Design a binder for this molecule. Structure first.
Ligand SMILES: *[C@@H]1O[C@H](CO)[C@@H](O[C@@H]2O[C@H](CO)[C@@H](O)[C@H](O)[C@H]2NC(C)=O)[C@H](O)[C@H]1NC(C)=O
Ligand SMILES: *[C@@H]1O[C@H](CO)[C@@H](O)[C@H](O)[C@H]1NC(C)=O
Ligand SMILES: *[C@@H]1O[C@H](CO)[C@@H](O)[C@H](O)[C@H]1NC(C)=O
Ligand SMILES: *[C@@H]1O[C@H](CO)[C@@H](O)[C@H](O)[C@H]1NC(C)=O
Ligand code: NA
Ligand code: NA
Ligand code: NA
Length: 1283
């Protein structure tokens, strides 16, 4: 008995079981058919006659939920039979696919993805108009939602920008239909900081015994792609002889090495020789070891026998071919020899054809027992394989062959061929996972049978057909697709039959259905290599085109069904390129034309098509080709250097042509930036030549000095055959001063209602110590507080910001900008877009600090902070105005956490580490923090409404504490909260705050002198604004405006958030409707003129560079608002200093000139009640040419752990973060390597400072063993004073 039914069950589809009775004992067989959570309970007493099959239909009830489903077939009466099958229920009629342009992404880049939705017919579902797609990070935060993502021909396409500092790990693209997951796909985001490199070792030509040698390509690269320089020790082991061949060579990224054998004579046609390569990186001595087995071959080709079927049929023709291939898998053409099969007296002397085949049609007589296929070539090569005859028990097969094409209402014709003379065989045809038709066929003891079937409409547009019989005591089958070509998407993609060449263009040719959507994608196998262990898109898409998917291929599994039979019967057995979508257009074809990227790599090109009617069309296999750059140059530069330092700029050349060529490398002196040591400053370029053999990196370098601070352009051109082949690069080195220059900005504003003339004099000479070189100074006119801010929105501070609080510079300022230019109703679209986009990036970024709590902490993982949770939570709520990507539930969770932290009395205490003493401290009854939390909730209407209880209790607390609030910081916040709340005590609170204010009468300044004067003065200004005290507010603004950092922000984080809010609020209310003024800048002997006449000025520069002068005169005349700024760029000497910190450095003895181990110890100097600092950072600066490795920090003290290590400026600077410091000694050791040759180097330094009060800091200088200029140069450019 043979029982075949579908394996998958649906809500309405008729389930058709087929039972075939080929048993010749009885005349009929009787069967019980149980089909059974307890939702289905259908049974049928069924009769099946001999030499026939029955088809039993089952109506599936509409209300079928998920559960456990079974089918049971029991032989009733005098016939034992028990068979059983698991039946998988399917909820949906549709299937989903996600295509991602890359498997791994880096911090910078964009994820592009497409969501494919096809129904059972493999076409866009008519019902499904849109989908729900959500992307979340490695910790499941929702970063991007598309609630209603429209399908266009079944496809939805979109992208996500990855943040500069994103969550590393596995991200999830999730697709949902009607609130149920249809498809999920992951992708990785990884860091390039994998400074470890990988070594490749492969033969450069395939080794033949006759060569008596092995030629090897050794290749060493970092993951990003840059070549590594080192020394490679190559060993090759001959163990039969106890031999060991050794060679060493310097490898500049890529090298060749020939190892010569002695009397090498293999016992077989093949021998594996083990090779070991130790690659020692240049200065670091980082060693990577790579091993492989290298096969030496006697012949340049191999033969295998490819047979039409594993065994032959005694009287019938037998088709096979001798397949010749080279040892790289490619066809080997023109290989000649003599084939002979003596059993049949067959013989032919011929050569392998263009496909590498020698085709054979042999003819065994029934007599013939086996076929001995001999091949002998004059080179001594021989190949023999025996073919045996078919043995019914193990060898029997049945095959299916389509004899006519397949059309709508026509007969389909098949030749069924079996090894056995058939008394029966069975067919089944299934479409959309159900058996549509089946038959019991009775050949009259015949090996061949012409099967004919009418194509029915339920078979349209795609069906398949299974045939099966019993031979011996095993079930043999075959199958075929039934693809109706007239109803198909006949999609095809092809590439022009030529060498595809980097930089040049190529033409893509494609054909299909006129309307059809086409999705294209190309991946380099380098990106596929590292992670092919996960699910490829092309395998997914190609599978769905066919059927279903460990162990071995089960045809029934894949066809969507199960088989069962008698117990004793067996069954037989680095940017994305060509991410384009297009349409096929009028003629049924399109030709897309594209530029091939300038890179050496191998491509995997893919294309699919979906037609709204004809559905899914796919290409057979992916298109493959390689692009090989003839010639290129790779740079290897330090991130930064300093003026006066002699630096070697090292490059490496690569030649991929067939011969050795002299390369000419030119380094340019761009805008007087570059001195070439040993030649005049007037020279604009320097050219050196070097020979470059094929496939061997050769180094080239230039000894230079930098003339100018800033960005040095590194402009190089290289060529080989009189310029028939060139490469160029445009790169950057940062030239820096000795001391981290600390810019001062003096600013004065004017706000003219009526036509006014005013003359502002400015003295400059408060600007020198012992050495200042020559401080450089610039005047700036700005129409708005936000012009420089908006300009600098991504880089507002000159201080690191890697902590939860600090990280809000990438978020809050964007809100300030947006909600200011909304209040003024600005139409400057570019500006709004910019702040909007960065706000989005900032959300992604802030999420790093969300805790399991639902709270926000100072570090990626730490106890939540009530300050931070109030700060972030409310700030995000505000941000819902401008971006839709904010997770509301996530915000609610944060604010609930915050609300639960409140005390019965209404008071808030700190939680987690104390990084900001003045805010978090509980030395003044918790007024600051309580006031802040209330303030933050008060600023947002939605939060106000949803946490009325917290505000009420909070305001009661303040009301109780008011008489004791003696600290201007606390009072300024409490007052502002009261103003927002309209608390009866607001007028009283503000009067008190005013009473504590200070004055500078000479400058018309009002401010508050606390240890954080910017914050408290800013909070006071908000209250002034809220109380409409505009005239008394200008002296306050006068002061604040003048504490601003060069970018328009304030030098620090909270200073910036409160400060800009306050300035911006005050600005909106005091500045005229229109700006119409003239500014005359008079200095020494000159006069510069500026005119501002628009109000919608904002993206406007009015920079100017005063020279080394003493005085300055600014005459303003007209109407409007403006900022008059002077910027100083001091160049103070680099000197040891300490104020309230102790910092000691010591260099440890490494025993290598190329390694620096710097021991750092810092501690705070406690005084009176001030025992610990705020959050403290250490920055370590390196000498020019040094780089830190992967984990540069060791021997950390444990008392007070480093909470964060950040490596920046190409491993040139290391920032370490602490919650705070006291008198404990916080030490660590930093390891760095000398990576670049630099002479006459300037000293480096280490800093420690209190983040929220940078006046408290220490700085210590250090020097590394000074390299000599005479060691640094190559003999050509070594100057006069050397030798
Ligand atoms: C690439 O596919 C996109 C859809 O992902 C096509 O853009 C759509 O074009 C149709 C025109 O019928 C509009 O109704 C949609 O609004 C467009 N969608 C979006 C979001 O752009 C686009 O035409 C395709 N590209 C080409 C040139 O063939
Ligand atoms: C991706 O999303 C779905 C549902 O959210 C889930 O099945 C799957 O586990 C997720 N993948 C990962 C890596 O968490
Ligand atoms: C092995 O390398 C050397 C140096 O390139 C070359 O001359 C020799 O021909 C190579 N062997 C083969 C068989 O290519
Ligand atoms: C690496 O080895 C070289 C050569 O032996 C030596 O000069 C150098 O000191 C070593 N570097 C380190 C980091 O130990
Ligand atoms: Na806190
Ligand atoms: Na001042
Ligand atoms: Na030096």
């Amino acid at each position: 008995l043979l029982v075949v039914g579908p394996k998958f069950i649906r809500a309405n589809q008729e389930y058709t079981l087929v039972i075939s009775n080929f048993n010749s004992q009885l005349s009929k067989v009787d069967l019980l058919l149980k089909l059974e959570l307890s939702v289905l309970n259908v049974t049928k007493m069924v009769d099946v006659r001999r030499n026939m099959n029955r088809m039993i239909n089952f109506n599936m009830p509409e209300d079928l939920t998920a559960g456990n489903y079974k089918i049971t077939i029991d032989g009733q009466r005098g016939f034992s039979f028990h068979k059983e099958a698991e039946l998988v229920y399917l909820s949906k009629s549709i299937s989903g696919l996600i295509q991602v342009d890359k498997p791994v992404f880096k911090p910078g880049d964009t994820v592009n993805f497409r969501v494919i939705v096809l129904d059972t017919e493999l076409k866009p579902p008519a019902r499904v108009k849109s989908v729900y797609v959500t992307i979340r990070d490695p910790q499941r935060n929702v970063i991007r939602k598309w609630s209603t993502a429209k399908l266009y021909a079944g496809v939805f396409e979109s992208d996500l920008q990855i943040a500069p500092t994103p969550m590393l790990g596995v991200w999830n693209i999730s697709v949902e239909v009607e609130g149920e997951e249809l498809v999920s796909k992951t992708f990785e985001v990884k860091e390039y900081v994998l400074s470890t490199f990988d070594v490749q070792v492969m033969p450069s030509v395939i080794p033949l015994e006759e060569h008596q040698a092995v030629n090897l390509t050794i290749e060493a690269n970092y993951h990003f792609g840059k070549p590594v320089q080192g020394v490679a020790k190559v060993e090759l082991y001959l163990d039969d002889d106890k031999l060991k061949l050794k060679k060493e060579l310097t490898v500049y990224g890529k090298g060749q090495v020939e190892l010569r054998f002695d009397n090498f004579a293999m016992d077989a046609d093949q021998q594996d020789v083990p090779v070991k390569v130790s690659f020692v990186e240049q200065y670091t001595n980082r060693t990577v070891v790579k091993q492989s087995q290298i096969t030496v071959y006697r012949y340049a080709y191999r033969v295998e026998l490819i047979k039409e079927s594993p065994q032959f049929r005694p009287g019938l023709p037998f088709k096979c071919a001798l397949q010749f291939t080279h040892h790289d898998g490619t066809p080997a053409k023109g290989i000649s020899g003599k084939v002979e099969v003596s059993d049949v007296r067959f013989e032919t002397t011929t050569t392998s054809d263009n496909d590498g085949l020698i085709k054979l049609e042999l003819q065994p007589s029934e007599g013939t027992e086996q076929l001995s296929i001999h091949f002998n070539a004059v080179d001594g090569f021989f190949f023999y394989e025996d073919v045996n005859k078919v043995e019914t028990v193990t060898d029997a097969y049945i095959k299916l062959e389509l004899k006519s094409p397949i059309k709508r209402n026509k007969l389909m014709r098949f030749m069924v061929t079996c090894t056995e003379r058939m008394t029966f065989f069975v067919y089944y045809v299934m479409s959309k996972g159900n058996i549509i038709d089946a038959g019991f066929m009775r050949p009259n003891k015949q090996p061949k049978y012409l099967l004919q079937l009418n194509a029915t409409e339920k078979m349209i547009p795609r069906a398949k057909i299974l045939i099966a019989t019993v031979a011996g005591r095993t079930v043999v089958y075959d199958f075929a697709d039934l693809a109706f070509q007239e109803l198909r998407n006949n999609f095809d993609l092809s590439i022009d039959e030529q060498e595809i060449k980097p930089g040049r263009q190529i033409e893509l040719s494609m054909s299909g259905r006129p309307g059809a959507y086409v999705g294209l994608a190309a991946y380099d196998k380098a990106l596929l290599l590292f992670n092919k262990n996960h699910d490829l898109f092309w395998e997914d898409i190609g599978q769905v085109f066919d059927g279903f998917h460990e162990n071995e291929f089960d045809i029934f599994h894949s066809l969507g069904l199960f088989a069962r039979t008698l117990d004793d019967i067996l069954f037989d057995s680095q940017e994305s390129w060509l991410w384009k979508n297009v349409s096929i257009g009028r003629s049924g074809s399109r030709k897309l034309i594209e530029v091939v990227p300038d890179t050496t790599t191998s491509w995997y090109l893919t294309g699919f098509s979906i037609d709204p009617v004809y559905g899914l069309g796919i290409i057979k296999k992916p298109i493959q080709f390689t692009t090989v750059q003839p010639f290129y140059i790779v740079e290897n530069l330090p991130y930064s250097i300093k003026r006066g330092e002699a630096v070697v700029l090292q490059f490496t050349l690569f030649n991929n042509l067939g011969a050795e060529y002299i390369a000419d490398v030119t380094l340019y002196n761009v805008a007087n930036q570059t001195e070439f040591v040993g030649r005049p400053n007037t020279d604009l370029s320097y050219t050196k030549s070097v020979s470059v053999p094929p496939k061997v990196g050769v180094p080239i370098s230039f000894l230079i000095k930098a003339r100018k601070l800033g960005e040095m352009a590194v402009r190089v051109k290289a060529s080989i055959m009189l310029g028939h082949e060139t490469d160029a690069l445009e790169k950057v080195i940062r030239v820096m001063p000795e001391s981290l220059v600390q810019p001062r900005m003096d600013t004065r504003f004017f706000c003219f209602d009526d036509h006014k003339n005013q003359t502002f004099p400015i003295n400059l000479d408060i600007n020198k110590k012992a050495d200042s070189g020559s401080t450089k100074i610039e005047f700036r006119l700005n129409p708005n507080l936000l012009t420089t801010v908006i300009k600098n929105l991504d880089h507002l501070l000159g201080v690191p910001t890697g902590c939860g609080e600090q990280n809000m510079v990438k978020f809050v300022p964007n809100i300030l900008v947006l909600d200011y230019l909304h209040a003024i109703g600005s139409k400057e679209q570019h500006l709004i877009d910019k702040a909007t986009n960065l706000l989005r990036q900032g959300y992604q970024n802030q999420m790093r600090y969300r805790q399991t709590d639902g709270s926000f902490g100072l570090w990626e993982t730490t106890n939540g902070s009530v300050f931070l949770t109030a700060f972030v939570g409310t700030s995000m709520q505000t941000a819902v105005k401008y971006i839709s990507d904010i997770d509301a539930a996530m915000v609610e969770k944060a604010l609930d956490w915050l609300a639960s932290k409140q005390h019965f009395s209404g008071r808030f205490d700190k939680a987690g580490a104390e990084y900001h003493k003045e805010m978090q401290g509980g030395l003044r009854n918790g007024v600051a923090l309580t006031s802040y939390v209330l303030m933050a909730l008060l600023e947002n209407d939605i939060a106000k409404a949803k946490h009325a209880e917290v505000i009420q209790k909070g305001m009661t607390y303040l009301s109780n504490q008011f008489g004791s609030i003696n600290n201007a910081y606390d009072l300024s916040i409490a007052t502002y909260a009261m103003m927002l709340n309209g608390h009866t005590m607001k007028e009283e609170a503000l009067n008190k705050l005013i009473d504590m204010s200070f004055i500078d009468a000479d400058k018309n300044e009002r401010f508050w002198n606390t240890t954080n004067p910017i914050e408290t003065t800013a909070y006071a200004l908000l209250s002034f604004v809220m109380a409409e005290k505009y005239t008394d507010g200008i002296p306050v603004m006068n002061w604040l405006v003048n504490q601003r950092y060069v970018t328009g922000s304030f030098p620090s984080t909270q200073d910036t958030f409160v400060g800009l809010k306050a300035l911006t609020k005050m600005a909106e209310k005091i500045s005229p409707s229109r700006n119409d003024y003239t500014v005359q800048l008079k200095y020494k002997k000159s006069a510069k003129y500026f005119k501002i006449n628009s109000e919608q000025i904002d993206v406007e520069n009015f920079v100017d560079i005063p020279e080394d002068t003493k005085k300055l005169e600014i005459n303003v005349g007209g109407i409007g608002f403006g900022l008059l700024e002077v910027v100083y760029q001091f160049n103070l000497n680099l000197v040891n200093f300490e104020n309230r910190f102790q910092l000691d450095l010591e260099k440890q003895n490494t025993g290598s000139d190329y390694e620096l181990r710097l021991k750092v110890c810092a501690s705070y100097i406690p005084q009176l009640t001030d025992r610990r600092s705020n959050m403290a950072l250490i920055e370590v600066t390196l000498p020019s040419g040094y780089v830190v490795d992967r984990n540069p920090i060791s021997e950390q003290t444990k008392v007070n752990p480093i909470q964060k290590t950040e490596i920046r400026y190409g491993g040139t600077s290391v920032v370490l973060y602490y919650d705070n410091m006291g008198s404990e000694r916080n030490c660590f050791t930093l390891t760095a390597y000398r990576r670049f040759k630099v002479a006459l180097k300037r000293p480096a330094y280490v800093v420690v400072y209190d983040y929220y009060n940078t006046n408290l800091n220490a700085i210590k200088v250090y020097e590394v063993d000074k390299q000599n200029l005479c060691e640094i140069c190559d003999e050509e450019d070594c100057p006069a004073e050397c030798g």
